[PDB]
Amino acid sequence: VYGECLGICAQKFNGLTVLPPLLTDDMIAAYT
Protein backbone atom coordinates (compact mmCIF):
# COMPACT_ATOMS: atom_id res chain seq x y z
CA VAL A 1 0.00 0.00 0.00
CA TYR A 2 -2.17 19.50 1.10
CA GLY A 3 0.60 20.28 3.62
CA GLU A 4 2.45 17.61 5.59
CA CYS A 5 5.71 16.93 7.46
CA LEU A 6 7.98 13.90 7.61
CA GLY A 7 10.64 12.78 10.08
CA ILE A 8 11.31 18.46 6.86
CA CYS A 9 7.93 20.18 6.63
CA ALA A 10 6.15 21.82 3.70
CA GLN A 11 2.91 23.76 3.13
CA LYS A 12 0.59 24.35 0.20
CA PHE A 13 -1.21 27.55 -0.74
CA ASN A 14 -4.58 25.79 -0.65
CA GLY A 15 -4.96 25.92 3.15
CA LEU A 16 -5.21 22.12 3.42
CA THR A 17 -3.19 19.76 5.59
CA VAL A 18 -3.16 16.36 7.28
CA LEU A 19 -2.40 15.82 10.95
CA PRO A 20 -0.32 12.88 12.28
CA PRO A 21 -1.84 10.11 14.48
CA LEU A 22 -1.07 9.71 18.17
CA LEU A 23 0.06 6.14 17.63
CA THR A 24 2.68 5.54 14.98
CA ASP A 25 3.01 2.30 13.02
CA ASP A 26 5.82 1.04 15.23
CA MET A 27 3.69 1.51 18.33
CA ILE A 28 0.97 -0.51 16.68
CA ALA A 29 3.47 -3.17 15.70
CA ALA A 30 4.40 -3.45 19.37
CA TYR A 31 0.75 -4.05 20.29
CA THR A 32 0.20 -6.74 17.71
Partner: protein
Protein backbone atom coordinates in the same frame (compact mmCIF):
# COMPACT_ATOMS: atom_id res chain seq x y z
CA UNK B 1 9.53 18.95 39.89
CA UNK B 2 6.31 22.62 42.58
CA UNK B 3 4.53 21.42 39.44
CA UNK B 4 4.80 22.17 35.73
CA UNK B 5 3.68 21.03 32.29
CA UNK B 6 5.99 18.41 30.87
CA UNK B 7 6.23 16.44 27.67
CA UNK B 8 7.00 12.75 27.51
CA UNK B 9 6.91 9.73 25.28
CA UNK B 10 3.82 7.74 26.12
CA UNK B 11 3.97 4.25 27.55
CA UNK B 12 2.22 1.53 25.57
CA UNK B 13 1.42 -0.56 28.62
CA UNK B 14 2.86 -2.24 31.70
CA UNK B 15 6.20 -4.00 31.31
CA UNK B 16 5.55 -7.70 32.01
CA UNK B 17 6.87 -11.08 30.97
CA UNK B 18 6.14 -14.72 31.63
CA UNK B 19 8.55 -17.56 31.02
CA UNK B 20 7.42 -20.27 28.65
CA UNK B 21 7.30 -23.84 29.84
CA UNK B 22 6.35 -26.97 27.97
CA UNK B 23 6.42 -28.92 31.22
CA UNK B 24 4.56 -26.83 33.76
CA UNK B 25 1.17 -25.18 33.91
CA UNK B 26 -0.26 -22.36 35.99
CA UNK B 27 -3.80 -22.49 37.35
CA UNK B 28 -5.88 -20.29 39.76
CA UNK B 29 -6.47 -21.48 43.31
CA UNK B 30 -8.98 -18.78 44.28
CA UNK B 31 -11.41 -16.31 42.71
CA UNK B 32 -13.23 -13.03 43.17
CA UNK B 33 -16.40 -11.38 41.95
CA UNK B 34 -16.68 -7.80 40.78
CA UNK B 35 -19.16 -5.50 39.10
CA UNK B 36 -18.51 -3.32 36.05
CA UNK B 37 -20.66 -0.31 35.16
CA UNK B 38 -21.49 0.44 31.52
CA UNK B 39 -23.53 3.26 30.02
CA UNK B 40 -24.98 3.84 26.55
CA UNK B 41 -27.33 6.56 25.18
Amino acid sequence: VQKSIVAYTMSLGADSSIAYSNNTIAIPTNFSISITTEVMP
